PDB file of C-alpha atoms in Angstrom:
ATOM      1  CA  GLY A   1     -55.760 -20.947 100.050  1.00  0.00           C
ATOM      2  CA  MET A   2     -54.651 -22.939  96.983  1.00  0.00           C
ATOM      3  CA  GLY A   3     -51.870 -20.373  96.443  1.00  0.00           C
ATOM      4  CA  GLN A   4     -52.353 -20.596  92.659  1.00  0.00           C
ATOM      5  CA  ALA A   5     -53.376 -17.787  90.289  1.00  0.00           C
ATOM      6  CA  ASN A   6     -53.895 -17.252  86.541  1.00  0.00           C
ATOM      7  CA  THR A   7     -50.564 -15.383  86.666  1.00  0.00           C
ATOM      8  CA  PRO A   8     -47.461 -15.817  88.899  1.00  0.00           C
ATOM      9  CA  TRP A   9     -47.406 -12.108  89.836  1.00  0.00           C
ATOM     10  CA  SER A  10     -51.034 -12.371  91.002  1.00  0.00           C
ATOM     11  CA  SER A  11     -50.478 -14.422  94.172  1.00  0.00           C
ATOM     12  CA  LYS A  12     -47.609 -14.319  96.696  1.00  0.00           C
ATOM     13  CA  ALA A  13     -46.828 -18.047  96.362  1.00  0.00           C
ATOM     14  CA  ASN A  14     -47.391 -17.998  92.584  1.00  0.00           C
ATOM     15  CA  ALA A  15     -44.932 -15.101  92.145  1.00  0.00           C
ATOM     16  CA  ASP A  16     -42.185 -16.816  94.181  1.00  0.00           C
ATOM     17  CA  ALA A  17     -41.997 -19.876  91.892  1.00  0.00           C
ATOM     18  CA  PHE A  18     -41.849 -17.495  88.905  1.00  0.00           C
ATOM     19  CA  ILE A  19     -38.808 -15.778  90.455  1.00  0.00           C
ATOM     20  CA  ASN A  20     -37.032 -19.055  91.311  1.00  0.00           C
ATOM     21  CA  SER A  21     -37.828 -20.624  87.916  1.00  0.00           C
ATOM     22  CA  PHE A  22     -36.609 -17.423  86.214  1.00  0.00           C
ATOM     23  CA  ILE A  23     -33.128 -17.644  87.783  1.00  0.00           C
ATOM     24  CA  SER A  24     -32.694 -21.433  87.537  1.00  0.00           C
ATOM     25  CA  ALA A  25     -34.010 -21.254  83.951  1.00  0.00           C
ATOM     26  CA  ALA A  26     -32.156 -18.065  82.944  1.00  0.00           C
ATOM     27  CA  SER A  27     -28.909 -19.476  84.386  1.00  0.00           C
ATOM     28  CA  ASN A  28     -29.325 -22.491  82.070  1.00  0.00           C
ATOM     29  CA  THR A  29     -30.478 -20.467  79.040  1.00  0.00           C
ATOM     30  CA  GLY A  30     -27.943 -17.773  78.073  1.00  0.00           C
ATOM     31  CA  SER A  31     -24.798 -17.401  80.205  1.00  0.00           C
ATOM     32  CA  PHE A  32     -25.402 -15.662  83.555  1.00  0.00           C
ATOM     33  CA  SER A  33     -21.942 -16.458  84.966  1.00  0.00           C
ATOM     34  CA  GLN A  34     -21.741 -17.231  88.701  1.00  0.00           C
ATOM     35  CA  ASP A  35     -20.930 -13.518  89.074  1.00  0.00           C
ATOM     36  CA  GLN A  36     -24.273 -12.578  87.474  1.00  0.00           C
ATOM     37  CA  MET A  37     -26.123 -14.934  89.842  1.00  0.00           C
ATOM     38  CA  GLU A  38     -24.766 -12.858  92.748  1.00  0.00           C
ATOM     39  CA  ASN A  39     -27.038 -10.029  91.550  1.00  0.00           C
ATOM     40  CA  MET A  40     -29.964 -12.387  92.221  1.00  0.00           C
ATOM     41  CA  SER A  41     -29.140 -11.917  95.915  1.00  0.00           C
ATOM     42  CA  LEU A  42     -30.557  -8.408  95.392  1.00  0.00           C
ATOM     43  CA  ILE A  43     -33.062  -9.202  92.621  1.00  0.00           C
ATOM     44  CA  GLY A  44     -35.386 -12.199  92.168  1.00  0.00           C
ATOM     45  CA  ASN A  45     -35.399 -14.143  95.458  1.00  0.00           C
ATOM     46  CA  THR A  46     -34.984 -10.658  96.964  1.00  0.00           C
ATOM     47  CA  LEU A  47     -38.445  -9.700  95.676  1.00  0.00           C
ATOM     48  CA  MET A  48     -39.799 -12.162  98.263  1.00  0.00           C
ATOM     49  CA  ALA A  49     -38.345  -9.900 100.976  1.00  0.00           C
ATOM     50  CA  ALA A  50     -40.546  -7.098  99.598  1.00  0.00           C
ATOM     51  CA  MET A  51     -43.655  -9.243 100.159  1.00  0.00           C
ATOM     52  CA  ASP A  52     -42.737  -9.388 103.865  1.00  0.00           C
ATOM     53  CA  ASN A  53     -43.712  -5.697 103.966  1.00  0.00           C
ATOM     54  CA  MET A  54     -47.224  -6.712 102.866  1.00  0.00           C
ATOM     55  CA  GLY A  55     -47.641  -8.636 106.142  1.00  0.00           C
ATOM     56  CA  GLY A  56     -48.939 -11.724 104.300  1.00  0.00           C
ATOM     57  CA  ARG A  57     -51.438  -9.897 102.058  1.00  0.00           C
ATOM     58  CA  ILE A  58     -50.774  -9.637  98.309  1.00  0.00           C
ATOM     59  CA  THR A  59     -53.042  -8.271  95.553  1.00  0.00           C
ATOM     60  CA  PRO A  60     -53.176  -8.156  91.716  1.00  0.00           C
ATOM     61  CA  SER A  61     -52.924  -4.346  91.564  1.00  0.00           C
ATOM     62  CA  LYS A  62     -49.960  -4.369  93.975  1.00  0.00           C
ATOM     63  CA  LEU A  63     -48.046  -7.218  92.295  1.00  0.00           C
ATOM     64  CA  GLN A  64     -48.900  -5.604  88.943  1.00  0.00           C
ATOM     65  CA  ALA A  65     -46.523  -2.724  89.756  1.00  0.00           C
ATOM     66  CA  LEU A  66     -43.921  -4.980  91.417  1.00  0.00           C
ATOM     67  CA  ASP A  67     -44.215  -7.632  88.675  1.00  0.00           C
ATOM     68  CA  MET A  68     -42.813  -5.052  86.233  1.00  0.00           C
ATOM     69  CA  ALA A  69     -39.934  -4.300  88.634  1.00  0.00           C
ATOM     70  CA  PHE A  70     -38.731  -7.919  88.362  1.00  0.00           C
ATOM     71  CA  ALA A  71     -38.393  -7.394  84.591  1.00  0.00           C
ATOM     72  CA  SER A  72     -36.388  -4.175  85.053  1.00  0.00           C
ATOM     73  CA  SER A  73     -34.279  -5.732  87.834  1.00  0.00           C
ATOM     74  CA  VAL A  74     -33.611  -8.945  85.882  1.00  0.00           C
ATOM     75  CA  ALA A  75     -32.803  -6.893  82.763  1.00  0.00           C
ATOM     76  CA  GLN A  76     -30.325  -4.605  84.565  1.00  0.00           C
ATOM     77  CA  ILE A  77     -28.512  -7.696  85.898  1.00  0.00           C
ATOM     78  CA  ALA A  78     -28.231  -9.551  82.574  1.00  0.00           C
ATOM     79  CA  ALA A  79     -28.414  -6.466  80.318  1.00  0.00           C
ATOM     80  CA  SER A  80     -25.275  -5.242  82.120  1.00  0.00           C
ATOM     81  CA  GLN A  81     -23.535  -8.588  81.497  1.00  0.00           C
ATOM     82  CA  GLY A  82     -22.259  -8.904  77.916  1.00  0.00           C
ATOM     83  CA  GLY A  83     -23.062  -5.812  75.816  1.00  0.00           C
ATOM     84  CA  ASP A  84     -24.775  -8.276  73.445  1.00  0.00           C
ATOM     85  CA  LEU A  85     -28.263  -8.114  75.000  1.00  0.00           C
ATOM     86  CA  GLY A  86     -29.487 -10.400  72.190  1.00  0.00           C
ATOM     87  CA  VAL A  87     -28.614 -13.465  74.302  1.00  0.00           C
ATOM     88  CA  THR A  88     -29.955 -12.029  77.575  1.00  0.00           C
ATOM     89  CA  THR A  89     -33.194 -11.534  75.639  1.00  0.00           C
ATOM     90  CA  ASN A  90     -33.372 -15.301  75.092  1.00  0.00           C
ATOM     91  CA  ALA A  91     -31.956 -15.945  78.582  1.00  0.00           C
ATOM     92  CA  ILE A  92     -34.309 -13.596  80.462  1.00  0.00           C
ATOM     93  CA  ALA A  93     -37.198 -14.310  78.064  1.00  0.00           C
ATOM     94  CA  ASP A  94     -36.613 -18.085  78.188  1.00  0.00           C
ATOM     95  CA  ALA A  95     -36.527 -17.945  82.006  1.00  0.00           C
ATOM     96  CA  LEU A  96     -39.829 -16.018  82.033  1.00  0.00           C
ATOM     97  CA  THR A  97     -41.273 -18.347  79.376  1.00  0.00           C
ATOM     98  CA  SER A  98     -40.611 -21.528  81.394  1.00  0.00           C
ATOM     99  CA  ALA A  99     -41.732 -19.850  84.643  1.00  0.00           C
ATOM    100  CA  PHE A 100     -45.078 -18.937  83.036  1.00  0.00           C
ATOM    101  CA  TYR A 101     -45.945 -22.594  82.367  1.00  0.00           C
ATOM    102  CA  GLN A 102     -44.004 -23.710  85.454  1.00  0.00           C
ATOM    103  CA  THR A 103     -46.227 -21.442  87.588  1.00  0.00           C
ATOM    104  CA  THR A 104     -49.703 -21.045  86.014  1.00  0.00           C
ATOM    105  CA  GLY A 105     -49.519 -21.492  82.221  1.00  0.00           C
ATOM    106  CA  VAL A 106     -50.009 -18.007  80.734  1.00  0.00           C
ATOM    107  CA  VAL A 107     -48.603 -16.637  77.460  1.00  0.00           C
ATOM    108  CA  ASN A 108     -44.963 -15.638  78.054  1.00  0.00           C
ATOM    109  CA  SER A 109     -44.952 -13.502  74.883  1.00  0.00           C
ATOM    110  CA  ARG A 110     -47.410 -10.997  76.397  1.00  0.00           C
ATOM    111  CA  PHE A 111     -45.235 -10.372  79.482  1.00  0.00           C
ATOM    112  CA  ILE A 112     -41.844 -11.232  77.942  1.00  0.00           C
ATOM    113  CA  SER A 113     -42.746  -9.003  74.969  1.00  0.00           C
ATOM    114  CA  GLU A 114     -42.708  -5.962  77.282  1.00  0.00           C
ATOM    115  CA  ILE A 115     -39.500  -7.154  78.984  1.00  0.00           C
ATOM    116  CA  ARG A 116     -37.795  -7.988  75.667  1.00  0.00           C
ATOM    117  CA  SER A 117     -38.255  -4.337  74.628  1.00  0.00           C
ATOM    118  CA  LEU A 118     -37.127  -3.088  78.062  1.00  0.00           C
ATOM    119  CA  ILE A 119     -33.913  -5.165  78.060  1.00  0.00           C
ATOM    120  CA  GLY A 120     -32.888  -3.770  74.650  1.00  0.00           C
ATOM    121  CA  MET A 121     -33.431  -0.290  76.138  1.00  0.00           C
ATOM    122  CA  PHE A 122     -30.774  -0.834  78.831  1.00  0.00           C
ATOM    123  CA  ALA A 123     -28.306  -1.643  76.025  1.00  0.00           C
ATOM    124  CA  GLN A 124     -28.678   1.952  74.785  1.00  0.00           C
ATOM    125  CA  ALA A 125     -28.062   3.390  78.272  1.00  0.00           C
ATOM    126  CA  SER A 126     -25.027   1.139  78.848  1.00  0.00           C
ATOM    127  CA  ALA A 127     -23.594   2.455  75.558  1.00  0.00           C
ATOM    128  CA  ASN A 128     -23.203   5.855  77.259  1.00  0.00           C
ATOM    129  CA  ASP A 129     -21.010   4.330  79.988  1.00  0.00           C
ATOM    130  CA  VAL A 130     -18.403   3.188  77.441  1.00  0.00           C
ATOM    131  CA  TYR A 131     -18.525   6.673  75.876  1.00  0.00           C
ATOM    132  CA  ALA A 132     -20.856   9.491  74.760  1.00  0.00           C
ATOM    133  CA  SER A 133     -23.161   8.318  71.947  1.00  0.00           C
ATOM    134  CA  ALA A 134     -22.413  10.030  68.613  1.00  0.00           C
ATOM    135  CA  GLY A 135     -24.897  11.549  66.137  1.00  0.00           C
ATOM    136  CA  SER A 136     -23.765   8.786  63.753  1.00  0.00           C
ATOM    137  CA  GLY A 137     -23.409   5.093  64.675  1.00  0.00           C
TER     138      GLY A 137
END
């Protein structure tokens, strides 16, 4: 009906704006070079393709699990760009912060807080790619 919901990952139309606002906002927050935006072709606007499997029926318990995926997908894209995840934190977080108010108006800290900790986690895994972690920093 209205297509609005207390949270963007609660309705199908409310989640879309959150994804679009996250990329347009994240691309203007940290760096996200044009090469990083290419990943969006698989993450973000791609999430909409997953809704097509629903057949036009979305739910809070279903988007609840997928909503978290967007954070892990957006983190892997930016967390992989620039070992310094400190900026991606502000970039990804800022994008999610503006999308929150740009979509429904919920606290971005509650959701971004979980993503902020997840993004920093990818930094530890990417450290293994450059080499094997050592007992001492």
